[PDB]
Scaffold this motif. Structure first.
Motif, mmCIF file in Angstrom:
data_model
loop_
_atom_site.group_PDB
_atom_site.id
_atom_site.type_symbol
_atom_site.label_atom_id
_atom_site.label_comp_id
_atom_site.label_asym_id
_atom_site.label_seq_id
_atom_site.Cartn_x
_atom_site.Cartn_y
_atom_site.Cartn_z
ATOM 1 N N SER A 12 0.186 -3.283 -1.222
ATOM 2 C CA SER A 12 1.120 -4.172 -1.370
ATOM 3 C C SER A 12 2.530 -3.580 -0.532
ATOM 4 C CB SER A 12 1.587 -4.664 -2.914
ATOM 5 O OG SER A 12 1.841 -3.269 -3.536
ATOM 6 N N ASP A 13 3.408 -4.565 -0.091
ATOM 7 C CA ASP A 13 4.553 -4.119 0.572
ATOM 8 C C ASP A 13 5.769 -4.229 -0.127
ATOM 9 O OD1 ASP A 13 5.585 -3.188 3.106
ATOM 10 O OD2 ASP A 13 5.825 -5.117 3.986
ATOM 11 N N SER A 14 5.761 -4.922 -1.268
ATOM 12 C CA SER A 14 6.893 -4.942 -2.281
ATOM 13 C C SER A 14 6.661 -3.946 -3.407
ATOM 14 C CB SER A 14 7.040 -6.509 -2.698
ATOM 15 O OG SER A 14 6.030 -6.696 -3.504
ATOM 16 N N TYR A 15 6.381 -2.905 -2.989
ATOM 17 C CA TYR A 15 6.203 -1.742 -4.184
ATOM 18 C C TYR A 15 6.900 -0.442 -3.751
ATOM 19 C CZ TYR A 15 3.925 1.762 -6.764
ATOM 20 O OH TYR A 15 3.859 2.882 -7.791
ATOM 21 N N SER A 16 7.562 -0.036 -4.752
ATOM 22 C CA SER A 16 8.056 1.482 -4.492
ATOM 23 C C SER A 16 7.892 2.461 -5.762
ATOM 24 C CB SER A 16 9.768 1.327 -4.143
ATOM 25 O OG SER A 16 9.881 0.590 -3.161
ATOM 26 N N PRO A 17 7.743 3.826 -5.763
ATOM 27 C CA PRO A 17 7.425 4.288 -6.696
ATOM 28 C C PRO A 17 8.605 4.379 -7.772
ATOM 29 C CG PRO A 17 7.256 5.830 -4.574
ATOM 30 C CD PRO A 17 7.908 4.510 -4.427
ATOM 31 N N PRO A 18 8.084 4.553 -9.060
ATOM 32 C CA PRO A 18 8.948 4.165 -10.399
ATOM 33 C C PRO A 18 10.520 5.159 -10.181
ATOM 34 C CG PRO A 18 6.799 4.435 -11.018
ATOM 35 C CD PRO A 18 6.949 4.811 -9.762
ATOM 36 N N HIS A 19 10.347 6.268 -9.504
ATOM 37 C CA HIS A 19 11.707 7.085 -9.665
ATOM 38 C C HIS A 19 12.507 6.310 -8.608
ATOM 39 C CE1 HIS A 19 10.812 8.740 -5.619
ATOM 40 N NE2 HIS A 19 9.637 8.738 -5.851
ATOM 41 N N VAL A 20 12.356 5.583 -7.387
ATOM 42 C CA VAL A 20 13.024 4.833 -6.585
ATOM 43 C C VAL A 20 13.674 3.709 -7.396
ATOM 44 C CG1 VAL A 20 13.327 3.708 -4.387
ATOM 45 C CG2 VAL A 20 11.646 5.649 -4.592
ATOM 46 N N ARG A 21 12.966 3.070 -8.475
ATOM 47 C CA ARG A 21 13.438 1.977 -9.243
ATOM 48 C C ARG A 21 14.527 2.555 -9.912
ATOM 49 N NH1 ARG A 21 10.528 -1.047 -6.278
ATOM 50 N NH2 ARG A 21 8.485 -2.003 -6.938
ATOM 51 N N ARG A 22 14.463 3.714 -10.643
ATOM 52 C CA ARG A 22 15.428 4.276 -11.262
ATOM 53 C C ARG A 22 16.379 4.741 -10.636
ATOM 54 N NH1 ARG A 22 13.508 5.574 -16.644
ATOM 55 N NH2 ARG A 22 15.373 7.006 -16.919
ATOM 56 N N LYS A 23 16.368 5.242 -9.455
ATOM 57 C CA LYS A 23 17.550 5.500 -8.494
ATOM 58 C C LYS A 23 18.368 4.211 -8.326
ATOM 59 C CE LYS A 23 17.010 8.770 -5.548
ATOM 60 N NZ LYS A 23 16.253 9.238 -4.380
ATOM 61 N N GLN A 24 17.702 3.283 -7.731
ATOM 62 C CA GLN A 24 18.407 2.141 -7.626
ATOM 63 C C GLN A 24 19.191 1.484 -8.589
ATOM 64 O OE1 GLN A 24 15.486 -0.701 -5.748
ATOM 65 N NE2 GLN A 24 15.397 0.424 -3.750
#
Lengths: 49, 48
Positions: free
Chosen positions: B4-16
């Motif tokens: 999938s192209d709309s996925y990032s690692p969870p730590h990236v979500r936390r950083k954002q």
């Protein structure tokens, strides 16, 4: 708003550590001599050099 | 997950999320205005 005394103390300390210039807000950023004037205190008493 | 192209690692979500919290809740104060904040007591804001 009436800033506390420690606020003015830290403002003066910051001015000392950074520089006298570059702070010309001239409203409340630095306490001036004329502010000390009150009923029984004249900050400009005559003196003989 | 990798395909999938709309996925990032969870730590990236936390950083954002942390960056968004900083942008939406930071306090605009000068350096002398910040030191005096430490000495002032806390916990009585909703009581005093």
């Amino acid at each position: 708003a009436r800033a506390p005394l420690l606020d003015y103390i830290y403002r003066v300390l910051h001015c000392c550590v950074c520089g006298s210039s570059t702070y010309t807000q001239q409203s409340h950023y630095i306490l001036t001599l004329a502010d000390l004037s009150s009923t029984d205190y004249d900050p400009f008493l005559p003196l003989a050099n | 997950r990798l395909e999938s192209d709309s996925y990032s690692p969870p730590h990236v979500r936390r950083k954002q999320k942390i960056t968004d919290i900083v942008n939406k809740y930071r306090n605009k104060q000068l350096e002398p205005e910040f030191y005096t904040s430490l000495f002032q007591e806390v916990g009585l804001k909703n009581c005093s």
